[PDB]
């Protein structure tokens, strides 16, 4: 990872720590679950909700995600939507 | 969109602990309360 990525991550999860006065574990698992997007992760720690009206991701899920199997990945998909099912196998890659 | 990686050099360098690898591991593998 190049310090320029890093310098720009440490520079949101700071700002994010005093925004909503968290410390760095619960901001960093934050974004963990919400495979590192930002307003997600943000929408989340003021509400506790994404904005997308899904779920953020539990160990259960992650694990599911790795199971070739099609009724565990359609199950995945009523869950979460196509969409964040692909960004969640890009993130975890 | 942060990476995972990036996110775990990150962590590491704002934890300043010699246990922030265990620590970030922990963090992915337990669920969010």
New interface residues.
């Given amino acids: 990872?190049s310090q320029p990525?890093?310098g720009?991550?440490?520079k949101?999860?700071?700002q994010l720590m005093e925004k909503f006065n968290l410390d760095?574990?619960t901001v960093?698992?934050?974004?963990?679950?919400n495979?590192?997007?930002?307003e997600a992760t943000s929408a989340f720690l003021a509400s506790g909700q994404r904005a997308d009206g899904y779920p953020?991701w539990?160990?259960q899920d992650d694990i599911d995600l790795q199971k070739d199997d099609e009724d565990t990945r359609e199950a995945l998909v009523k869950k979460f939507g196509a969409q964040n099912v692909a960004?969640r196998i890009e993130?975890?890659? | 969109t942060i990476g995972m990686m990036t996110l775990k050099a990150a962590f590491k360098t704002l934890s300043g602990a010699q246990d922030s690898e265990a620590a970030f591991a922990k963090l992915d593998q337990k669920d969010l309360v």
């Fill in positions: 990872v990525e890093v720009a991550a440490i949101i999860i700071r760095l574990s960093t698992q934050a974004f963990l679950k495979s590192g997007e930002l953020i539990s160990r960004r993130f975890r890659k």
